[PDB]
Structure formats: C-alpha cells, structure tokens
Design a protein around this ligand. Sequence first.
Ligand SMILES: Nc1ncnc2c1ncn2[C@@H]1O[C@H](COP(=O)(O)OP(=O)(O)OP(O)(O)=S)[C@@H](O)[C@H]1O
Ligand SMILES: Nc1ncnc2c1ncn2[C@@H]1O[C@H](COP(=O)(O)OP(=O)(O)OP(O)(O)=S)[C@@H](O)[C@H]1O
Ligand SMILES: Nc1ncnc2c1ncn2[C@@H]1O[C@H](COP(=O)(O)OP(=O)(O)O)[C@@H](O)[C@H]1O
Ligand SMILES: [Mg+2]
Lengths: 90, 280, 276, 280, 95
Amino acid sequence: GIHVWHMPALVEIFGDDSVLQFGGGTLGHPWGNAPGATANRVALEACVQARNEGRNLAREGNDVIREAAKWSPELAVACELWKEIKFEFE
Amino acid sequence: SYYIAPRFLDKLAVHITKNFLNIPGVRVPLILGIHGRKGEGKTFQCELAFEKMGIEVTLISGGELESPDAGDPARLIRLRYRETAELIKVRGKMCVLMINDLDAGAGRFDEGTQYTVNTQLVNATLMNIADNPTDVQLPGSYDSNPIRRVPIIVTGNDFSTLYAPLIRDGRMEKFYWEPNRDDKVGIVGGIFAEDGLSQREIEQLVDTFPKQSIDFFSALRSRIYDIQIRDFIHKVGFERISLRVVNSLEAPPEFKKPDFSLAHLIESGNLVLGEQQRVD
Amino acid sequence: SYYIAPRFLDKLAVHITKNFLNIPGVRVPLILGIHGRKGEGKTFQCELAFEKMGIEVTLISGGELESPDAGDPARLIRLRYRETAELIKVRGKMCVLMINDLDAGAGRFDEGTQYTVNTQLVNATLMNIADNPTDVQLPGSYDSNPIRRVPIIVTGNDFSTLYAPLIRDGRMEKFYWEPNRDDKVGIVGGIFAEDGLSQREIEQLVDTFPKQSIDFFSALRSRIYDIQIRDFIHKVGFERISLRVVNPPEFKKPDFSLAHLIESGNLVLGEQQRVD
Amino acid sequence: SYYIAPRFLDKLAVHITKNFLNIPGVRVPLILGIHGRKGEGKTFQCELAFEKMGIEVTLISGGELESPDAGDPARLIRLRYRETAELIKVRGKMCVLMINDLDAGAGRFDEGTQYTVNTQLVNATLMNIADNPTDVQLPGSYDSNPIRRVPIIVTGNDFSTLYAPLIRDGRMEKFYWEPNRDDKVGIVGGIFAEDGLSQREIEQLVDTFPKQSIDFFSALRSRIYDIQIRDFIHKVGFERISLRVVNSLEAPPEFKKPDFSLAHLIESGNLVLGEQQRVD
Amino acid sequence: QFIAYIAYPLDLFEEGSITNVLTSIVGNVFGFKALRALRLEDIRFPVAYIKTFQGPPHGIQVERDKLNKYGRPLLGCTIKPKLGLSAKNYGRAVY
Ligand SMILES: Nc1ncnc2c1ncn2[C@@H]1O[C@H](COP(=O)(O)OP(=O)(O)OP(O)(O)=S)[C@@H](O)[C@H]1O
Ligand SMILES: Nc1ncnc2c1ncn2[C@@H]1O[C@H](COP(=O)(O)OP(=O)(O)OP(O)(O)=S)[C@@H](O)[C@H]1O
Ligand SMILES: Nc1ncnc2c1ncn2[C@@H]1O[C@H](COP(=O)(O)OP(=O)(O)O)[C@@H](O)[C@H]1O
Ligand SMILES: [Mg+2]
C-alpha cells in the first residue's frame, strides 16, 4: 500500500540497500503500466538527487516531488490522482 | 472585489470555528445546510468567504454523484473526506469540504420529489460520518490511527425528508439565506463598482426590480455589446457576416467601451423581465 | 452525563425484554406507543436508552409515510421489518424498529382535507405485523419459513386520530409521557451538570419558567455559548482566525449564572411573544 | 387449553369440509367472511381451529392489496391460489387460503378518498376465482388443465364498504360474530384455567367489565409479569441484558407464578381502563 | 465474535498440493489490520480434490496385516533422556 507521495519517507527510513515494490501503485495509473512505472522512477530519482545535495526529506520532501512534476507529464497525472499525505517522522 | 453579506460570513465563521475548537461539555453540528432560491449566490458567497479566510476548499459536484454512470457516491464521499483531513496536517490550515446541488442538477425532473437508490447512498454515507467523524473507513487498508474531524457545508433549494433525523438530532444545522435591500445594494454595488455608478443610481436599480434574483442583475452587464454587434452586421452586410469572422485572416473586431448609464440598464431590464414572463 | 428518567427507562426495557423472552401462556403487545406534548424528549430519551443497552435501531421517519406512489409507504415497512429480523439472526443481539411521528402519516384530522389509499394501507400493514410477527411476506413467491420476532416503538403527538383497531390493549401498550417537577429537575440538572450549579439553584430555574419544554433549556445553553464564540471571532479577526485555532487563548468561559439564566430566558420568551 | 367457541368451530368446520366433499346437485360458496367488532377473536379463534384440525394456511396481508405496479396485487392472488392448490396434490391434506383484514384492502372509507385501479381489480379477481375455482390462468400461454378447489377465509371489521357483487349468497357465505355471556365466561375461564379460580369468581370478572372485548382480559396477564421481569433486568444489569436473553450459554430464566386473586385482577383492570381513558 | 462460512471454487488450487491450498487460504488474511483475532476452525474437502492426493502410504488395515497384530491396541516407548546417551547405550535401553 504505497504510492508516489510515500517516496521521500521510504527512501530515508529504509536507506539505499532496499527493494521498494508497488502493487496497486504502478498498475492503477490512469494511462497504463508504462507511464505508471515512469512516474515511480522519476519520483525515486529526484529524492536520491535531493538527498545527496544535503536536503532534509522530512521538511523539503513534498517540494522535491512538485519540482520534478514540472518537466515530467507522467508524474503530474499521478500527483493529481493520489493525494499528498504527511508523515510524522523525526 | 465582490461584496459579502455580514450575516452569511458570520454563519460560516461560527460553524467552522466551533468544529475546530476543542471545548468540553459542548456539542457541535458537523453538517451545515443552506437552502434558498436559485441564483441567490450561495455558492458564490462560500467561495469568496474562504478566500478572505484563506482556508482550503474541496468542491464536489452535485452531478458527480447523481449520474448513474459516475461510480459510487458511498465510496466517493468517504475518499474526499479522508483527503481533506490530510490537508490540515500537511497544509497546517483549516480545510472544509462542501457539496453543491445534492438533490439537483442530476437531470431528473423530481429534484428530490422522488428518492433514488443514489439518493439513499448519500444519506447513509453522511449519517455514518456525522456519528463517527474521527474515524472513517474505506473498503481496504483499514487504519487504526484517527483522522482530524472536518466540517461539511451543503447547499440546495430545499432538503429532503430523509435528512429530518439528523436535524432533530441537531447534528445538522439548516440556514435559510434570503437577500434584503441592504444586501442587494452591496452585491449590485460590487458588480458595477468598476463601471462607476453613484449610490443613488444603485438604489434605483434595486427599486426597479424589488422582487428579483441576484443572478438577474449580474446578467444585465452581458447585453451591452448588442447594439454594437447589430450595427456592425449592417456595415459588413448579411451576405458575408460569417466568412470574415469565422475563418478569415483580418484585424479582429474592435469595440469601444460601452457608455454606462441608468437609462440603458432599465431598458435592458425590461426586456429580460418580458422574456421570463412569457416563458413562465 | 445526560439524565434518563427512571420511569422512561423501565417502560422501554420491560417492553423489549418481554418480547424476546418466551414465557408460555402469555400474549404480549408488539407495539409500545409513547405520546404527549411536543418537545418533551420522546425521541431523545429513547436514543439514550438504546445506547445504554447497546441495541441496534432501525429508523423510519414520519415524513416518509406519504409518497406519490400507492402502496409505497406500506411496502417500506415490510421491507425494513425483514431487514431487522435478519440482524437479530446475524449480529445475535436485540434489534428494534422505531417509527417516529406516526401521527403525520396515518393520522386523520379534519374532514376538510383530501386523503388517499396510503392512509388506509399504513394502518392495515401495522395491524397484520402485530398479528403475525413471524409471517411477513416479501412480494413474489410465498415462503413458509419463519423469521425472528421484532418489537416496534411508535412515537406520536396524538393517537385519537388513528384507525380504531390499531389502538387496542391486545395490540399496543400505551404510555403517556408528561415530565413532572422531579423529572424536570433531574433532566435540567443533567444539562448543566458540567457547568457547576448547586441543587437549589437548579430548582429555582425550573420554578422561574414552569411552562416550558425540555428543548427550551437546551436551546438556552446554545444561546449563551453563541454570543461568546461570536465575540471571540471578532477579537481575533477574520484574517488570522485559522492560525490561532489549528494550534483556545484569550477565550472567556461562558457566563452560566443563575441570575443571568433567568434574564436570558425572559428575552427568549419576549421574542416568542413578538411573533405571537 | 384455550377454549374455542362451539359456534365458531362448527361454522368453520362445515365450510371447509363441504368444499372438499362432492355432493351432486348442491352448489356451495367458496368464500367464508367473518365480521364483527375489534378484539372479539375472529383471527385468533381461526388459528386455534386450523391447528386443532392440523391444516396448512397460506396468508395474504390486507395491506398488500395495492402496489406501485398496476395489476400486481391482481397477479398475487392468482399466484397464491395456484400455490395452495399444489399443496393439496402433493401433501395430501386440507389447505386453506386466508386474507386477513379485507376491509382496508379493497374497501372505500368515504366518498372523498382518491383510489386507484388496483382496488377495482382485486374485487374482480376474487369474483372470478369464486365463480371458477378450477380454471385460474397464470399469465402467458393458455392451458386447459384443471387444478384442485381451494376454500378462502376472509376477516373484516366492516363489509359494508366493499364491492356489492362480491358479497352475495352464491359467492360468499356470511357469518357475524358477537360472543354472549356464556361464550365470555367460557373463553375468559380458558385463559385463567391454569391459575385456578372458582366459577363464581370468573362470573364476577365478566360482570365488573361487561362492555369489553376478549383482548382486554388477556392484556391483564401481561401486566402481572412486569415486576418479576423488571427485577431480572436489574440483577443482570442494564449494560448486558441483551447478551443474557438473546445469545447466552445459560438456561432461560424461570419466573414463579404470581398471586392470582379477583381483588388484584380488578385493581390491574382498572389501571388499564385508566390508561385507555387518558388517550380518550 | 462470529463464525463465518466461505466457499471457494475447485479450479483455484493446484492438484495434489497441501502447500498451495494452505498458502492460498491463510496467506494474507491473518495480518488484516481491521481484525483483532482470527481462527480457522475447519475446512471441508470435496471428493474431486481428494482424488488428486496419494493419502497415507499404507493405512490402518494394511499396517495390522503386515505386523500380524489384532485384537489389542499397540504399545510403545520413548528412550530417556532426550539427549545425552551414546549409540551403544541407546541400543541397550532399546533391547
Ligand atoms: N433527556 C434530555 N437530556 C438533554 N436534552 C434533552 C433531553 N431530552 C430532550 N432534550 C433536548 O430537547 C429536545 C427534545 O425533543 P425530541 O428529542 O425531538 O423529542 P420530542 O420533541 O418530545 O418528540 P415529538 O416531537 O413529540 S414526536 C432534544 O432535541 C434535546 O436537544
Ligand atoms: N378464544 C380465545 N381464547 C383465549 N384468548 C383469546 C381467544 N380469542 C381471542 N383471544 C384474545 O383476544 C385477542 C383477539 O384478537 P383478534 O383475533 O385480532 O380479534 P379480532 O376480532 O380478529 O380483532 P380485529 O377485528 O382483527 S381487530 C387475541 O390476541 C387473544 O389474546
Ligand atoms: N456577492 C456576489 N457578487 C457578485 N456576483 C454574485 C454574488 N453572489 C452571487 N453572484 C452571482 O451569482 C451567480 C452564481 O449563482 P450561485 O452562487 O450558483 O447561486 P445559487 O447557489 O443560490 O444558485 C454568478 O453569476 C455570480 O456572479
Ligand atoms: Mg384480528
């Protein structure tokens, strides 16, 4: 039970040496399996890029997803369907 | 720059405030319902009030849960309620969900005269949320963790008898909003503020049509270019009005700003009165 | 925190229990009928009672018993009865059908009004359920398979204007609810239990306004609270009312004083007289 | 140990037997209609009579003879007649159709009430069944193949408000029920037979309340058991009364027989009259 | 607390596999967050699904015929302690 908005928290908690699996997250995309996979890939790589620079994914995590969606049309549709949630990790 | 009536703002303030407030010994109605005549501006006032307050709004269409080929209202209202609850934490501001034309705009003739299967579902869903606002459940992925309570606004012409339990329970509050002379002056004054009309002029317009909907006065502004268009057609000629405008590369038609006078508005007012009279 | 009148709770409990027990040789009425003056708390005290015992309620509103379709109010009663009978079988607990404000649907006041078939049918249906609680049919194919017996609670303002066979000792147990001084003291004392008023002070409030319904006192509390909340919104301001609410500072507690509870109540009566 | 009144048992016995028997040159009515006053025991003495003989009953509710679909109550009676006819062929015993409370079904209260067409058809359907008990056609394809003759028993408060051709000697056997003093003594004596009262004491109970239906005396007994039941609810506790009664792994509670004396019964009887007067 | 009865189609499971049927039924239902507790009481197996299994290699009847022992329950013994004894000392206790 994970989608594109859970990405900054899962990356930070589980670290780098882990496998993240999306059952209903990839398939349930409005456009199909191929744009659904691309949306998940862009969201993961943007968080990895932001982590390496020196940005806290607790405070700036939602800002990274919104910035990546400006050039990726596949992610912009995914952000419309699944709504953003707030994790309370410190 | 549109005027808001003080009474309308007050009713919204108290409902939203009280729900968000956490005072012991006090019971608060979760759902507020507003009934009035059509084109009173109930929807327009709600949208404006929220902007001044800066509170986030989620809108659900009346036709979105009335249509047979839409989905499932029971599953939908629940999903929208959860999403609105998430906003409070992330956004850090008050968030309200409102529904328009719960029993209207479906396309059906009855307008709540006769119940439907779909009508029953909304009643069922709403009643569950009103009793247990803190916990709302989807079909799958049941979460133990509680959600922040969210206020609900509903607007319509009238409320069905099915809702009578909720109102007697005091879980729902019904507000009847009717415009007055003072309210009319404000709203009419705001519409024509940009045009530039004297206070005496604005008073005359309301006085001309004492018993009129708010929508009518707004609609008057639209029929100002009619004289220009009619005169324009003549110069061009009926033979070739279409071709030049529809699909031709030329300078687009230019219209000088219409003169604003009280006389023009009275003449326009009479024509719309006549048409509405004949149709009904 | 709400006070239920001991008379009211014992009448409900004994009615439902006796329907569920199978004492041999005794015939029991399936309908309990509560009637009296408007706004005395007929519906409200039932809801408190049903919550205490933790028993499921199936509601039918009074403004539903007259539809533009012939037989449609009668068909609903049978449909809802069969739904409640199954809930006894499945959930394995006591379930009750409550029809509130029957006077509006099945009633017959003056002869100056025009009535329909439905008035006739709603009276007819309730008679047959009360005769055969175990044999209620759904439209279509007949089945001779028995169902669970379900008790019915009926609220009204008057039963004088109702079909004569539906009101008889053998078919309905009648209960006239008129709250006395001791009841009023308890109930009013339950509303203002949280505020902190002495017994003697509660007595005085009832004496000041004796010709009042239970709703009046509960409506009085809301009026006291609304003024306080309105002023708080004005003081804080509309622009930043959300910032000082989500995360209540500078909020004076409501008056709640015997001296004022008289003053405010007099103003309400004056407003009522203005319309009158 | 209920007393069934000889007249009531004889009249019902002969009507059913005479249909199932075949005597040449004798034409017999199909319908028996029992009418009288409320609570005299029309429905109840029928039920005791059907159980003594051990015969199957198919029940039609009077408040089912009108529907939003046209001709659907007309279809219902024709279907239930065939269903009962099959039970004679299969099970090989007497079967009876009963429509309880016909008065409020196919009846017209005043000359001001708006009625539909279903009322018109229900009268006609019973007319044709009573004429031809053998040929009842299920909608669709025709079939000329006879079914068994089934008697019908009808209860009502008033038959004066019913279609005139339906009530006639050749179509319906009429029977008016009103119990006398000897009937009352017998029936009321049957109620309190296990209690143990002298004959003189039974007489006195009838004398004290002479203008009363049978239901009144049965309602006395219900009130007597209240004290024991109220005590039981307290001992178990209001929190978990449902569990004990409905769904418990314990033997259902036993109540000792309360003291039954004429003085105590009259006291309770006057309490029921007072409750009736309160509404009156 | 209630007993729930659930039916499953025959063509949902692999033939001759206890592993597969056990993984399908009790896989991801016991960790469902909306339930406090769950217990599987009983399973009905149909005749059509039983015929795909070998069952017991011999059974009661054949076991008694091979051993030539009937009219009496069989007797057994467990060597104590559970762990400690040598292979030779184990066989001495067995004899
Ligand atoms: N026991 C109580 N404790 C606290 N408030 C009560 C109590 N009883 C009644 N009230 C209040 O007063 C109102 C009583 O009205 P209802 O519950 O609608 O019953 P009712 O009006 O007597 O039934 P009708 O109209 O004759 S069919 C409720 O809405 C409560 O707000
Ligand atoms: N023979 C009897 N022996 C014992 N109790 C009887 C006897 N007859 C009637 N009663 C009681 O009185 C009640 C009579 O109810 P009904 O059979 O409905 O009389 P009724 O004349 O059919 O009423 P209406 O006309 O349908 S209202 C029953 O509930 C019984 O408790
Ligand atoms: N305060 C206002 N100022 C300007 N226009 C208004 C105002 N209130 C309503 N309107 C007009 O009303 C119309 C929309 O009506 P709506 O809000 O849907 O009313 P209702 O919900 O009562 O039918 C628009 O043309 C809008 O400009
Ligand atoms: Mg009867």
